[PDB]
Design a protein around this ligand. Structure first.
Ligand SMILES: Nc1nc2c(ncn2[C@@H]2O[C@H](COP(=O)(O)OP(=O)(O)NP(=O)(O)O)[C@@H](O)[C@H]2O)c(=O)[nH]1
Ligand SMILES: N[C@@H](Cc1c[nH]c2ccccc12)C(=O)NC1CCN(Cc2c[nH]c3ccccc23)CC1
Ligand SMILES: [Mg+2]
Lengths: 166, 469, 166
């Protein structure tokens, strides 16, 4: 059974961490606990073949910027998150791509751009700008809600597809 | 209540219902409950749970303001005494004074515990979470007012030590050891020659020692003030979280001095002496349970500029390819193997802080702040417990201090370390990386030759400590 | 990782607090601040086990004599402390052993009599007097100082060895 090792990178303190959590917990349970190991392994059926997702989310450790190389190296696929209400967290995306590209030694790493709506503040990065930016790169773009769990699986499955179809 | 006087006046004689407290799974553990019911239990008359106090004062700020806590506990402290009863009422009216058998039952079983358990909350709140008071004088003022105008003879002993703690706190560590600390070890650089100090001329043993002292000192300064409420991720990270930040920046710097020392030693033989001297440090870091330091060194080896240097690591001794790989395996599989080693060494240690950061942050941003039961909104307390669980695990390692003699000069050398100088993170990262491309260029371009830079002997002194007279 | 719950009991102002702190932090408290109910954890390794020590430092004054049977109820082993310069505090030990044996309904309760404050020559409770009692209860007698650290680890870990084999 294939196991896919996914890494979630992106600028800190913009609801980055809510992407992974909303995926794992069926968003029905109260008691959530990251202490619990294998609360970051998740088995799913994608396009018919069953596979095991293993998601690394280093949220909070963003100041440990030395370790970005160590953490990234561990990934088969990448998921770059920016908040749609934080213009900087988005312009940062350029940088994270080049780090990944370099840590893997590749030009064609499987990855996906994810616009994340975390609260209810004013969107300052348009659907269209993120659309175009991702087009320039050759990667898909998914928009997700941290409130309503909209398009959360939509963005992880897309990354698995980009790993198979690589 | 428990017993006796009219429940109307006293807010905390509210009876326990499914609409105001929720339990879980030999005390009881609270899943959720109203703010009143939470304070009632914080100072329950039946048992003192002292962990519950720490969980509360660590985390309460997310569901109740400091001013409103004080008001709330003052209210709890003021307990309606039972009216002179029916055999009291007939003893008062025929001369002598009553015996008061269920006034003193109430006063000894309910009023005595609850008032003392409340003073214990203030004693903690002041002696441990004093920040609430240095960021609000009126609060201190009210609290000081409260304590003065308590007037028991029972509480006379305890009012006294709280008034004196509030004094001690309004201004400003004698450590006793068993055994002596080993003698400070010296290599090429002799004592007081701070200019000749560098990775190769300082004794590897004494580097790892002084950086463990320094990294422990930094770990220990983190209050849980800087942790709760994910404050180290918001825009006021620098105001609310300066000691946590101060040690993440230290770790991040040393990882960069290591990267820089490797890729700037251009000559191959000399670089292999440097990569080896770093793994000889990583090995003394492990003898001292300095995980933070091990994960500097493993994190530096893993970095882009240093990972790719295959000609350099092909020449490391076989014993150290083993040491390096094994320390790398700590971080493997979600720090599985590391959390293992941590919850099993005999401290002092210096944990890797980053894991605790992520667990606090996921737990906050992954659990409900309230619980909608029967259209009422109980405070979700099992969430606040889980956070306090961590901040407690962290406090736990901050207790035992290292038995290593600090060397004034060597310590000032590493504080004043700055590999980046004046350049930014992108600027410096790129530079390091190109020096990697220069000293060991991509295939198929042939490995060039560079000249020696170090004028001193490159042999290591070994990491076995040497004990004279 | 085995987990042991030690409880320190004793006369008012013998050094229950001063010892417990010296054990956890290697620091000598000088100030006398009457304890109501403090609690501490210490990870330590005893005879090759990692033990998580869970130390409860109780109140000594008679004002809290109401509120004992609650901690005595959940404790695993008990550190009975008196000070070797206060003969009254030694005479009070008899009762502490008693409240414990009653609340525990048992005759076999892991304890260790500790004679604290032995860095002074002012000794008024003689070594024999104290030893003789310890033998009567079938438990070790260890003399300590919080100020000098002498015997502190010895007494606390002897309790743990006792809890283990019982
Ligand atoms: N010289 C000396 N003084 C000690 C020693 N142990 C405690 N003391 C002192 O005796 C006083 C009582 O200390 P403390 O431990 O707080 O007593 P306690 O056991 O907490 N009593 P309480 O029930 O009120 O908390 C303090 O001044 C403390 O410094 C010791 O071994 N030697
Ligand atoms: N030779 C094997 C096995 C090996 C694992 N750890 C090593 C340490 C030194 C030399 C070889 C190895 C191999 O594939 N080596 C390559 C991949 C690992 N490399 C060295 C290295 C740099 N940074 C690291 C961080 C952790 C583990 C190894 C390294 C060296 C090149
Ligand atoms: Mg005490």
């Amino acid at each position: 059974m294939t196991e896919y090792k996914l890494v979630v990178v992106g600028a800190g303190g913009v609801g980055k961490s809510a992407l992974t959590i909303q995926l794992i917990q069926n968003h029905f349970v109260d008691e959530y606990d990251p202490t619990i190991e294998d609360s970051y392994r998740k088995q799913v059926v994608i396009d018919g073949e069953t596979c095991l997702l293993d998601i690394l989310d280093t949220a909070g450790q963003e100041e440990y910027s030395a370790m970005r190389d160590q953490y990234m190296r561990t990934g088969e696929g990448f998921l770059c998150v920016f908040a749609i209400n934080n213009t900087k967290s988005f312009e940062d995306i350029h940088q994270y791509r080049e780090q990944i590209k370099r840590v893997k030694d590749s030009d064609d790493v499987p990855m996906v751009l994810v616009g994340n709506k975390c609260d209810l503040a004013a969107r300052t990065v348009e659907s269209r700008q993120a659309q175009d930016l991702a087009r320039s790169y050759g990667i898909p773009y998914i928009e997700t809600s941290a409130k309503t769990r909209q398009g959360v699986e939509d963005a992880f499955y897309t990354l698995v597809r980009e790993i198979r179809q690589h | 209540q428990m017993r006796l006087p009219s429940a109307d006046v006293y807010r905390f004689a509210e009876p326990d219902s499914e609409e105001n407290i929720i339990f879980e799974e030999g005390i009881p553990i609270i899943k959720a409950g109203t703010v009143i019911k939470l304070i009632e239990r914080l100072t329950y008359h039946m048992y003192a749970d002292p962990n519950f106090v720490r969980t509360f004062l660590t985390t309460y700020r997310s569901f109740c303001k400091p001013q409103e806590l004080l008001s709330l506990i003052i209210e709890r402290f003021e307990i309606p005494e039972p009216e002179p009863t029916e055999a009291d009422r007939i003893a008062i009216e025929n001369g002598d004074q009553p015996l008061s058998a269920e006034l003193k039952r109430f006063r000894k079983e309910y009023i005595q515990p609850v008032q003392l358990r409340v003073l214990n909350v203030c004693r903690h709140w002041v002696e441990h979470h004093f920040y609430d008071f240095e960021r609000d004088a009126y609060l201190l003022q009210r609290m000081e007012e409260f304590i003065g105008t308590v007037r028991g003879k029972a509480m006379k002993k305890w009012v006294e030590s709280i008034t004196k703690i509030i004094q001690r706190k309004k201004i400003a560590h004698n450590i006793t050891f068993q055994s002596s600390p080993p003698t400070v070890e010296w290599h090429i650089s002799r004592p007081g020659h701070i200019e000749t100090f560098d990775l190769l001329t300082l004794h590897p043993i004494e580097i790892a020692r002084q950086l463990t002292l320094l990294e422990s000192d930094l770990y220990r300064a983190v209050q849980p003030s800087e942790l709760v409420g994910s404050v180290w991720t918001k825009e006021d990270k620098e105001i609310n979280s300066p000691n946590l930040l101060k040690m993440i920046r230290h770790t991040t710097n040393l990882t960069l001095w290591f990267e820089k020392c490797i890729v700037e030693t251009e000559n191959l033989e000399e670089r292999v002496a440097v990569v080896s001297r770093i793994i000889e440090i990583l090995q003394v870091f492990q003898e001292l349970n300095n995980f933070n330091g091990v994960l500097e060194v493993v994190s530096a080896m893993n970095s882009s500029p240093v990972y790719r240097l295959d000609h350099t690591f092909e020449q490391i001794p076989s014993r150290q390819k083993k040491i390096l790989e094994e320390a790398h395996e700590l971080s493997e599989d979600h720090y599985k193997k590391y959390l293992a080693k941590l919850r099993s060494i005999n401290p002092p240690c210096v944990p890797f802080f980053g894991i605790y950061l992520t667990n606090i942050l996921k737990t906050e941003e992954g659990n409900p702040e309230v619980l909608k039961r029967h259209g009422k909104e109980l405070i979700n307390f099992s969430k606040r417990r889980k956070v306090a669980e961590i901040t407690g695990e962290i406090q736990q390692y901050q207790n035992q201090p290292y038995c290593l003699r600090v060397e004034s000069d060597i310590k000032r050398f590493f504080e004043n370390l700055n590999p980046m100088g004046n350049s930014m993170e992108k600027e410096f990262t790129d530079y390091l990386f190109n020096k990697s491309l220069e000293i060991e260029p991509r295939n198929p371009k042939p490995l060039p030759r560079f000249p020696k830079k170090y004028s001193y002997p490159l042999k290591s002194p070994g990491v076995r400590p040497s004990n004279p007279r």
